[PDB]
Design a protein around this nucleic acid. Sequence first.
RNA 1: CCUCCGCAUAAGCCUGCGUCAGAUCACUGAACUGACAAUUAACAGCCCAAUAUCUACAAUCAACCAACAAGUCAUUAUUACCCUCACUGUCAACCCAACACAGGCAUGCUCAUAAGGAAAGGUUAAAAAAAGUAAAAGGAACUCGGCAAAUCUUACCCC
RNA 2: GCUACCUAAGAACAGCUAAAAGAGCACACCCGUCUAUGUAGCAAAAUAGUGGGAAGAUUUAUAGGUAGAGGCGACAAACCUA
RNA 3: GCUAAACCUAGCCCCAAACCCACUCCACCUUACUACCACAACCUUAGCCAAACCAUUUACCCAAAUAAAGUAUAGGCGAUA
Lengths: 123, 392, 45, 322, 101, 176
Amino acid sequence: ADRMSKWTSKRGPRSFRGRKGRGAKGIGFLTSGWRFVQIKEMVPEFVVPDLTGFKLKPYVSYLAPESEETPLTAAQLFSEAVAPAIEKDFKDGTFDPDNLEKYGFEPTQEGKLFQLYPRNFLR
Amino acid sequence: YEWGVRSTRKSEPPPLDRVYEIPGLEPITFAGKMHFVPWLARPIFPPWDRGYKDPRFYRSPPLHEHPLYKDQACYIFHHRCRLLEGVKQALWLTKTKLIEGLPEKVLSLVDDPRNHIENQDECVLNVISHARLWQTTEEIPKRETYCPVIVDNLIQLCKSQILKHPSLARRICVQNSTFSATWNRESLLLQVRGSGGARLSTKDPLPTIASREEIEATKNHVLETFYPISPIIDLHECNIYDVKNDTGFQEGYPYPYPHTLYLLDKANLRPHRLQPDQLRAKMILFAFGSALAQARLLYGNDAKVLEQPVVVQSVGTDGRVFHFLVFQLNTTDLDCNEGVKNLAWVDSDQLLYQHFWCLPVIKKRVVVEPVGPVGFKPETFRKFLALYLHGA
Amino acid sequence: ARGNEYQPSNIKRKNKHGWVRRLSTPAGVQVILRRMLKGRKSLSH
Amino acid sequence: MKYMVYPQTFALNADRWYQYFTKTVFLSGLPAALRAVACDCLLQEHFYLRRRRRVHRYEESEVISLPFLDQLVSTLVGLLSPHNPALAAAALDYRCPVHFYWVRGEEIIPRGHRRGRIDDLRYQIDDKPNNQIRISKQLAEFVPLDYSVPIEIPTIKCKPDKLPLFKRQYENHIFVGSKTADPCCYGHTQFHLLPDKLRRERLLRQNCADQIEVVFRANAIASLFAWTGAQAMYQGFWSEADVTRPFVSQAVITDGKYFSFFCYQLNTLALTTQADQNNPRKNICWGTQSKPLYETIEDNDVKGFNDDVLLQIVHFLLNRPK
Amino acid sequence: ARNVVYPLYRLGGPQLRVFRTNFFIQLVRPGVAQPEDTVQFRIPMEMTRVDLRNYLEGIYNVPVAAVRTRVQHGSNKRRDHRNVRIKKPDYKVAYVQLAHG
Amino acid sequence: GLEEFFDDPKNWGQEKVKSGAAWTCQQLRNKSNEDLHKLWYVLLKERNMLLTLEQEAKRQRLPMPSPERLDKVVDSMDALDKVVQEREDALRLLQTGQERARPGAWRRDIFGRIIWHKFKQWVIPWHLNKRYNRKRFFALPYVDHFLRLEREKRARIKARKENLERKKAKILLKKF
RNA sequence: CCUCCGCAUAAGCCUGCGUCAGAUCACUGAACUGACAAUUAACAGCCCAAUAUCUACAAUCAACCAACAAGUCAUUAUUACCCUCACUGUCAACCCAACACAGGCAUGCUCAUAAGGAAAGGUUAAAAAAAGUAAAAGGAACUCGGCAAAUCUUACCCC
RNA sequence: GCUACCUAAGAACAGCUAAAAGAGCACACCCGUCUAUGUAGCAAAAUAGUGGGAAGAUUUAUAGGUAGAGGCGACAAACCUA
RNA sequence: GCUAAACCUAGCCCCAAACCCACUCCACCUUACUACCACAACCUUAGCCAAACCAUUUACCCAAAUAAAGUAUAGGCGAUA
Ligand SMILES: [Mg+2]
Ligand SMILES: [Mg+2]
Ligand SMILES: [Mg+2]
Ligand SMILES: [Mg+2]
Ligand SMILES: [Mg+2]
Ligand SMILES: [Mg+2]
Ligand SMILES: [Mg+2]
Ligand SMILES: [Mg+2]
Ligand SMILES: [Mg+2]
Ligand SMILES: [Mg+2]
Ligand SMILES: [Mg+2]
Ligand SMILES: [Mg+2]
Ligand SMILES: [Mg+2]
Ligand SMILES: [Mg+2]
Ligand SMILES: [Mg+2]
Ligand SMILES: [Mg+2]
Ligand SMILES: [Mg+2]
Ligand SMILES: [Mg+2]
């Protein structure tokens, strides 16, 4: 006879308490006789770098001078990545409206391991 | 009168939107927004195929599409088959004549008092009492618990005679082994697939019981027939099969000879348990199958009368009633009814004990019958030992 | 003796007065709609 | 409410704890054509007998390893029956359960309506060994009672719960493999096969490479104490009326490739706090490292069959009551 | 990582990875007497014991032998001036048994 | 090791720890892509230390040495995440012209209100999905009256707000 | 001195007599407030590739016998199939009756306890009232009626 | 989620006599004959004692169904959240 | 002398003007707030009440305020419309 409390896996009868969980992402499946099969590949792997000889530390010196905040946009990214290559190739006759893929553009995301839309990677 | 009422079946899909009929135009459907709405038309979807294979979500080919599919129907006899006519049917299929009682050779084995084990009666009763009363924690053990354990202990008991007989060192008992044997009878294709544990395996084949004169005498006898029952009734009628004769072992297996097949009826329910007649049928076909498999291995795939017959024997039990069979396969040309016939000696309804009391019966505060086996007879164990000591 | 008419269970509570039970019929939908307009914090069990 | 003691356990360092519960000192060491029959059983399961349904890697321990161990025990006992007349008459069981129930130590209930009352800890061990051999006459002891040893019983600081161990209430059982009315009450040898969950290559996958020997050891101590413990009870001995002779049994624990051997002597059932207060007498368990029986099996032969392992199986079977 | 949509896997897929992991840990002093090898942790709900194993041995190079978890229920008994229940949040507790003794 | 869940023993229970300023978004933008990834784990370990330190103070019933550190650390990582997010977002625009990483649609729930429905991933196509087809992404007519009442309600609240604004200005004029 | 209660599971409830500090029929305290702790899976939940195809004979110690209301439990053929122990429940003196209510409340084990409990705030010994125990001689004379207490009867009539 | 009835899949019934039964005595359980207490009570129907049944048309746990111009009913105008 | 008493401002009401909000990450129609597998919507309002009962009947928002006009007309030619 309570409506206002949050509904949880603690709360039902036996069957109910089995079915619901907390938020944890499942990492396998079940087979006959309730045997759990784990898939190694479904388990997230921590991609953790080498920290040896690394100068950056978690806090910053106050002695550092202040600079104006300017966020990143597509326009300026194009200007400081693609634009110099394009204009340099515009000077000669190497540039082409077709096959501009040389500059880093891709027609499709289908083949890629890291597909941008829809996103297929974690963080 | 057709079966399956109308309400239970999958409902006939609703009639198509009338827009689809008009040849000029294509309908506006709710395909575009990826959900149902009632006002737009129902789209027709092209059938879908998962491009990759996934084991859990697998759909098998139609039955014609399987590689092993054949127009000619093979009939398979397995462990769960139950013959309608029993031994009568079994004999027909295996082309055999039965003889009541065991062979004289095996009965002569328990003739001498020497071959008897020390404290035979004491031991046998102990086996029954261990299996049937003292076994587990709970008071009254069930059949599937007591049936294999009683046989295991009776095998152990016979196996103690190694002291007396060195020949017993030349055998093993194997579990979870399988045989396959295929033949023809009036150009019906039949295949026996034998499953189940407790196969007695020896380095040496059994010598033949019956003489060549006996084998020649079988020719005059005619196989018994039953009408209007077909001899193929109660066998798994199969269109998808492969023909193979298998002894269940790879080439160069030590102990490759089938001495005895032990068969159990470890079923709790009466309807689940085979009838006595039906069980004797099962062991005939199994013994035949095991003998025929071995015959095909070393004598080839030809249909002929063998110069030296193969002997296999079998024991079938429920834990209480025992059936003993000796089988002799002397011929492989089985397609025609007339000629040389295989041989079978059978003893049936030989029960080890009449009843068993787990708990003492008290009527008016006095014990009518005490705990234990009731109506025990040792002659059935003698027969069991006789079959064990054969070929030793 | 009376008063103990409520003999509780989670299964029964949910199958009778739950969100899925509510949305199952148009009548129930309107029940939810009402509670939303009134500003109830419990729309259903 | 009793603790459920699991003989075959995933608990880290579970040998230490089991020694506490049973008051057991663990000691390192011990107190022909058989090769042909041994390797033939290996080849039977692995090679010679062909399988209709394909063998999965999870099912291999139950379908390959288990029927192998079934086979080896039954053959060796029959073959050695002329050597040892005891084994001729001996009864052997396949997957028969064994139960023992004892009390050791006390607690004060921390919370509830019974808070601050004295209570005793109950331990129940239920085990189903793959094979066991029972005899009518007791085996002779290894060492006498009051056999002082200069090695201390392990003591656990915290609650028994902190090693993952759980309390449950059910039927309290003493059982030797058969009921009381069976004359073969005394215990010869147990054969255990470890579950596929406690396999060594899985244990190498977790960082716990040092725990492979713990699993073997822990199984022995618990299951043997249970078995001898139960036998002593069938002779009328219990907590207050402690044993007047030693009760001995021996065990063979395997994973199908690696074999361990153990001998157990039970000297005392005085485990209850009141009984234990003044009693220097201890239970003793002997054991050795796991050794591979065979290196590998390819086609039709076994590579690097180690004979001494097979003989240690023989030497245990050869033991007879005097 | 938590509060992100995990990309689906089909057989023969690429190995799922995280590069920056939302999970944050506290190592806490146990309220009950423990074995010396056992150490206690407060853990995000959505974290698994598999995750915590990998987390510790990955980032901290701590070899672990065994991990067991449980979900601690925070009390909802407390009430404010407006007589409304104040919920103390539920958290996950992970016990880690270290390896190599 | 497990030891690095705690800071340097020399500064244990020191009442005050001198700590640096939180990283700025600008500073992090100058930093390399790979280097941000490395810095991010440096910030991870630091967070966990401070979180365990928070809890230990809470247990001992003592004040934390420098609680503001935690805030700084948090902010730095917020900043870092934002910086990285920006890069991904930028690249998406240049490659696909999609503003949102996860696909979705404007839909009409049964309550007749317009929602941004986010998609989920499935193995099978939508028409074959039993659970998905159970959902109603449309409003039947009976809902329209409620939509009216809802609107009217919103209007009332708004009207009330406006009035009070004016009234307040009036009294503020009489006092000044 | 009492125990027809207890211990456990289920069902229901949701931190609801653990620790520490203030604070207030009874302690100036606790079943009050705040802060801090805790319940670790082996038990239990959470399952299963496909298309055909199989499945006449109860249970009751299942034996003899005996029925009627006719009964909880089985596959085979071929194809496909190699990775492992994840997730959730686990506390308490507790639930439904507005209440710390002589009421309600399923199963297992203990059938009297090894477990769990306390009828008397202090006194005095009035009346009337409630529940007992005993009672000379008599034995229904009481009363609508042997109601009640007793005692632990017999023969009928109406329906 | 009470109660009336049904559906699915369960569970319970000691001891003693009985030619063996919708049998008899009699626990647990289910019901409520008669008396007294209670009557803002322990209780919006209880308690103490005494009684009826207690292997059956029995009792009972779980889930589902039938809805008011109606349901359900071994008909009491009974029951369908005091 | 206790218990008390006393307060002005939160806000709100009716107008006018003007056509409104639908919203970081995650989750949410299965037992909502739960990562992850082969049916469908449109269908005369009735009644209280008035008629001193009641039975035909009895005002109810339809797109310019005023006036035409409570007029023509309808109605158990009556209530009334
Ligand atoms: Mg009920
Ligand atoms: Mg758990
Ligand atoms: Mg389990
Ligand atoms: Mg007590
Ligand atoms: Mg009192
Ligand atoms: Mg008084
Ligand atoms: Mg008086
Ligand atoms: Mg008198
Ligand atoms: Mg009179
Ligand atoms: Mg008178
Ligand atoms: Mg009377
Ligand atoms: Mg009725
Ligand atoms: Mg009766
Ligand atoms: Mg009666
Ligand atoms: Mg009437
Ligand atoms: Mg009447
Ligand atoms: Mg009127
Ligand atoms: Mg009037």
